[PDB]
């Protein structure tokens, strides 16, 4: 009866009147655990439905003329775009914050920091800072391998020198993910087959600094795999991070499953991985050991975020459940002693975290 995680259903979005046809990747955004925005169509003009996660029973509904809407991860500040026209608004103060019109249409965007929305067009990736120039700086041009792909994620490392775009497409009756990992310092990309990814900061024992880790999961033709590779130059005085590559388990009845989401808990150094069919996986960031697996959802959890109050992962499925999984802070070392029988990992979990 001892579980190394803890489960929570925060809210059901059908309780707030959200029709499930607009509960999808194209219409629902969740850039952090504080807000959910949904674009709807009541009448023939559009609406946006903003849900405060600290007051979930009082949503607000404003009319819009935008094709996407993303709330800032920390304030009630909304970014809206209509093709090439981009705008950022303060909701409560009713104040326009900035605006820019592009030359190519922005097909995908996402806040990567408190100040920066990353913009993706059909051939390039831009960073649009709030406190900066008001023109978006071009970061890199998009590789040929990501052409004709549905762009699903963009993530950066903490100091924004390692950038990663992710798209998926259907090749040979399979959802093949194509990633472009870009280094700002050397100005070179690498086309990578991957499905879900995140960067992380990990301090090794015997190290004065942190190492910048790149973590990605993939289901290719050789099965499911999770890689934990250090990117960037290691500082002298620090040992290099030893490269990990472990298997990602899929059951025999789920050969049409693949990873769709990854968040990393920086407090506990734990990789959370969600698959398309609803399975959550927990890996240790240092060794890659699969701690725990369970199917937590019946529908596809299509957008995730960090859940900072519990240092976990929070997500929305297509039914409209807002679900969260985090490490149970009392139970995860009494799970690895008895149920997992890994005593060398369980007390090396204790020094750096507990």
């Amino acid at each position: 009866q001892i579980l190394p995680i803890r489960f929570q259903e925060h809210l059901q979005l059908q309780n707030l009147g959200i029709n499930p046809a607009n509960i999808g990747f194209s219409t629902l955004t969740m850039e952090s655990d504080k807000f959910i925005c949904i674009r709807e169509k009541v009448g023939e003009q559009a609406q946006v439905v903003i849900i405060d996660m600290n007051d979930p029973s009082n949503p607000i509904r404003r009319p819009i003329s935008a094709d996407s809407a993303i709330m800032n991860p920390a304030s009630k500040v909304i970014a809206l775009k209509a093709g090439k026209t981009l705008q950022i608004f303060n909701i409560e103060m009713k104040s326009k914050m900035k605006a820019h019109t592009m030359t190519d249409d922005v097909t995908f965007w996402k806040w990567i920091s408190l100040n920066t929305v990353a913009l993706v067009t059909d051939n390039a990736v831009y960073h649009w800072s709030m406190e900066g120039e008001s023109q978006p700086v071009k970061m890199f041009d998009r590789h040929s391998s990501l052409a004709g792909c549905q762009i699903i994620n963009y993530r950066t490392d903490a100091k924004q020198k390692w950038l990663l775009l992710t798209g998926i497409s259907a090749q040979q009756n399979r959802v093949v993910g194509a990633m472009q990992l870009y280094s700002v310092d050397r100005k070179v990309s690498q086309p990578i087959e991957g499905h879900a990814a995140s960067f992380a900061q990990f301090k090794m024992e015997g190290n004065a600094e942190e190492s910048t880790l790149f973590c990605f999961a993939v289901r290719g033709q050789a099965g499911g795999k999770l890689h934990i590779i250090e990117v960037g130059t290691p500082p002298t005085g620090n040992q290099p991070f030893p490269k990990k590559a472990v298997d990602v388990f899929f059951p025999p009845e789920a050969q049409n499953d693949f990873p769709v989401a990854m968040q990393i808990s920086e407090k506990h150094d734990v990789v959370f991985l969600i698959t398309k069919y609803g399975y959550i996986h927990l890996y240790d960031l240092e060794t890659g050991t699969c701690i725990y697996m369970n199917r937590i959802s019946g529908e596809t959890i299509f957008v995730t975020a960090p859940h900072e109050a519990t240092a976990g992962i929070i997500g929305v499925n297509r039914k409209g459940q807002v679900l969260s999984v985090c490490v149970e802070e009392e139970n995860i070392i009494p799970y690895i002693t008895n149920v997992l029988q890994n005593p060398d990992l369980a007390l090396r979990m204790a020094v750096r975290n507990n």
């Binding site: 472009q180 070179v188 990309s189 690498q190 590779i229 590559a245």
Partner: peptide, 19 residues
Amino acid sequence: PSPVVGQLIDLSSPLIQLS
């Protein structure tokens, strides 16, 4: 404009432990 591509990370795990 083409992107310049190369080998940033090694995805291969070695088949021999040379210590």
